[PDB]
Symmetry: D2
């Protein structure tokens, strides 16, 4: 889309109505806290009821306009649908949908685990589509934004994360296609895809113990990208990563072909 030709400021999120998924820990939790400090209305979700309550209480302490949680698993597509409808009622609308959750993923070779492939596709990809469809009427009303959190393994191939990579590549294909559609149909909803290197969440640090950028800063850069309506955000400890992983030729060919 057309990004905002503006400097980010935290007041861009003041009073904005934001869903954050996968917000009980890791990057999602940090995004909830940043949003709370900016004075946003937030609804957080994950499976962990008790941790979500603690996240909500801290968001209120930090200055959230309001904060609520709804607990459930994004394996359940009915839950996903119902979640968005309830979150919208809790906030009186929706300005930004931050899709961040994933199913449990560790480093292993692919041997015959079709169940993990299916579960990864359902939780990491299909649930994002279901959430988007449920959110789109509200986002069209607010000229809002969808933020999709992805990965280096969603842009290039790695061993040991085959099922995950499939799901993150699928997000790029799906959301980059609907971005093109929203441009031609003049739907004023931005789509931001975030491509992350190694981030120091507990999940990642445990996953890479047998082989990191700060999660607070990562979370802020994701929000900034969404607020500025950027097509993509690249975040890593090293500029070697963020500068070289970019594929400007793809965007050029998409334009020239159109």
């Amino acid at each position: 889309q057309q990004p905002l030709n503006e400097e980010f400021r935290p007041e861009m999120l003041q009073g904005k109505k934001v869903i954050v998924t996968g917000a009980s820990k890791g990057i999602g939790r940090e995004m909830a806290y940043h949003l709370a400090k900016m004075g946003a209305h937030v609804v957080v979700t994950a499976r962990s009821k008790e941790t979500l309550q603690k996240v909500v209480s801290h968001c209120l302490e930090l200055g959230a306009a309001s904060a609520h949680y709804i607990a459930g698993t994004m394996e359940d597509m009915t839950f996903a649908e119902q979640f968005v409808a309830q979150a919208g009622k809790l906030m009186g609308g929706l300005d930004m949908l931050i899709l961040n959750h994933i199913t449990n993923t560790s480093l292993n070779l692919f041997h015959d685990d079709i169940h993990h492939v299916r579960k990864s596709m359902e939780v990491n990809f299909l649930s994002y589509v279901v959430l988007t469809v449920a959110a789109l009427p509200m986002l069209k009303q607010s000229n809002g934004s969808i933020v999709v959190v992805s990965s280096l393994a969603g842009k290039v191939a790695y061993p040991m994360v085959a099922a995950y990579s499939a799901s993150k590549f699928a997000l790029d294909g799906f959301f980059s296609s609907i971005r093109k559609e929203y441009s031609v149909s003049r739907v004023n909803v931005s789509i931001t895809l975030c491509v992350l290197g190694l981030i120091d969440t507990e999940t990642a640090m445990k996953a890479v113990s047998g082989i990191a950028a700060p999660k607070e800063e990562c979370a802020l850069e994701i929000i900034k990208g969404g607020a500025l309506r950027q097509e993509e955000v690249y975040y890593d400890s090293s500029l070697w990563t963020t500068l070289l992983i970019r594929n400007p030729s793809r965007k050029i060919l998409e334009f020239l072909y159109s």
Copy 2:
């Protein structure tokens, strides 16, 4: 993987045992016919037994070492699994698995069509994984090859094909990751991803009603790439397309990051 350092010869397929899916029409049918002319053993599949019988009869006329069909839908993951077992039984093993079928797809904006997204992911992606898992023991025995048919819309973003693009991107992520795993684990099974522009199949010509490439030639280039164990085949009417769509920097970064 390492591609064979030699020119293609049709004799490379003589007596080879090959599965072709989506082989009742389009590129799949043309691949069956080329394989037949080369004296391969072929097992073809699609949903329509009537059309498949016609393909088998023509394959035998053309010189196939043997030809059989098994009809079913790749919506049914049990069928996918049992199909590979039966095809292997019929031929006495498997040298090449050509994964080509897709669910019916036309050009349309995405609105609230979760059904098509799920169907596309199941038929176009998950069934390919199920088929690969079922085929891998036989392919390991033969040091064989997997050929995955994909698309320009599986490498860059287009409007009007969101569900389809998600599934084709997913293929790239998944199969490119397992390719990395087979290299580190020294599994001698090659994986070839084919990226196709507009090809003059009846399906395509109806869907787009620019220059369309001939399906006979397309089919042959797919077989050549698989036989030569190339990582990727790019095929289009124009060299502007096949040369510019390639992304060598991705392959370089994957290597550097390893």
Copy 3:
């Protein structure tokens, strides 16, 4: 770094600008744009007769002043003396537009070392001499150098070997001194312009057949060069087709230059 503003013609009002190779083609069009913007201009080329016509039209168009000095850029003494004279006449210098080339036609290289040498002297070395002569004045004004180059100064083509050598040399030289000015805190911008086929008389005599119809307008080309210089852009890419200007860019080069820059210690210099 480039100015984060839209171009306005008032940015050149009262500015003191040299344009070389300005008797015809893109250089003449640049002089005309500058004149319309109310700049002070000094133009040069070998031919006094054609330069007279450019100066007279510049005055009609509303130049603050317009003058020519004729000479050949084969003569490095002329190059040096020309800048001193032009700057003294105008009372300073804000922009140096380096645009001239030696006469080049399309042909296979045929042992004509004389042409390789002449290309290197006129198209490349004279640009360096002009720059050295201008830099004190440009430092005084926090001014700009604009170097006009070519698609054949970024990728290789047959039939223009000597010319391409000279334009590649400009990129290597000027891109290196740009980096030096960054570390030495010299506030003089350098803009390298990469031009496709432009409908100058020279180009239209050189090319063949339908290629003539694939040329971009010289008036527009000239304005984009001036805009790039005024905005202190590092590079300007101009062509009749977006397929050209988008695909010919090599962003990986600037990325690697940046990534490589931390590994040397400039404190000695």
Copy 4:
């Protein structure tokens, strides 16, 4: 051009007739030594007869079919032309021309040394053209090869090497253009451009002292990769301590656009 679709073998250089310029020290000297070990005929040049004589002595001991030197400065285009003729006479022809010399260059900011700029252009660039013109008839006879030694600073920009970078960029523009001309004119002479990172020659090691702290690649290995690339008729050789450098500095998009652009124009004319 089309590279040979085969693995390098040292016998590819046995009995071949090779010129190496700038061969009294550094990479050039190492190239002479590898060629000698492969049983090539070699003629080496540089300004210093004393250092050239030592190279020839070692080449003869290593097993060169023959080894000679001719001393002179490549500032003198007359010497350049006459050198190639004499080298050709000494060997009875020419199979490979390796152009490697440069004028003395150190790291410094550019101020006003137009003399250094001109000398760089004359020694590092124009003399290569003169040598090529002199050699080409012999190379056409043998379906031979030209190897042009260049630099990271001949592909991307660096401060402190402005005059040198201009000359190496010029080599790319010129020799890449002639490669295209040889393709349309059906001249069966290969051109290989070599792009080198930091190599542990005495010149480089002295020059970067205190400025740079990175790995330097071995000059012996560098020299061998240059010969291999030339022997295999490759368009470009990239050599560095790190695969990060050699893989990322290559620009396949340029080669693709040149090809696509060529399909649009008819070269029968001019």
